[PDB]
Each structure stands twice: as structure tokens, then as C-alpha cells.
Design a protein around this ligand. Structure first.
Ligand code: SF4
Ligand code: F3S
Length: 106
């Protein structure tokens, strides 16, 4: 699986969905996740994310490990998203701010 990590939050550019061949992204109000059983590890989404928030499971930074299970969990409850949309309105302001998990919306 690939995994969406902290920097997506309050950014949610959604560039990642457009290259995904198996449509395994799931949408929250201010974050996206990857369903780990559906992802085929094609890695195509990684360079597409302007927030640089996507990692191979086995490359998630130590300080963002909680994102692995959180993707798996939210992918069960959020709706599939398969089309790009506009980034969140103040994405640029939040791109690169650390610790945005505190802002994650369910
Ligand atoms: S690695 Fe490939 S299959 Fe998995 S989420 Fe990214 S684009 Fe989709
Ligand atoms: S910011 Fe989030 S919505 Fe996709 S393009 Fe990056 S993982």
C-alpha cells in the first residue's frame, strides 16, 4: 500500500486521484486516504502530490507511522473519490505546516 500522510490535511489538492488506475482513494472533508487492500502499489500517485504527502507504506517517516492505520481505517468509512477537484481554499497557507493531524476532520 501507499499511504497519505500529514501534509495532505487542509491541502487536499486531489491531483493524486487522477493517476490512480484502481480508484482506491477515499475522501474526507479535508484529507484523502488510500485503501490498502485496493492499492496495487503502482507508485504513480507519489510524484503527483504537490504536498509530497504520499509515501510507500514502508517509507512512511517514523513520526507519521500512525497514518498507516489511519488510512486503512478511514478507507472503510469515507466515500470513494475518483475525480480531481479544486484544492482546499487556503492550501498554500497550510502546505508545509507540521502537525496537521490535530486538524483532521472526520
Ligand atoms: S500507488 Fe497506485 S494504486 Fe496505490 S493509491 Fe497510488 S496510484 Fe493508486
Ligand atoms: S494533498 Fe492529499 S488529496 Fe492527494 S494530491 Fe496530495 S494526497
Amino acid at each position: 500500500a501507499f499511504v497519505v500522510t500529514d501534509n495532505c490535511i487542509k491541502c487536499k489538492y486531489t491531483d493524486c486521484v487522477e493517476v490512480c488506475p484502481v480508484d482506491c482513494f477515499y475522501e474526507g472533508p479535508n484529507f484523502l486516504v488510500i485503501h490498502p487492500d485496493e492499492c496495487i502499489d503502482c507508485a504513480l500517485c507519489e510524484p503527483e502530490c504537490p504536498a509530497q504527502a504520499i509515501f510507500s507504506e514502508d517509507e512512511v517517516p517514523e513520526d507519521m507511522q500512525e497514518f498507516i492505520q489511519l488510512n486503512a481505517e478511514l478507507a472503510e468509512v469515507w466515500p470513494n473519490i475518483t475525480e480531481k477537484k479544486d484544492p482546499l481554499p487556503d492550501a498554500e497557507d497550510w502546505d508545509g505546516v507540521k502537525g496537521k493531524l490535530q486538524h483532521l476532520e472526520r
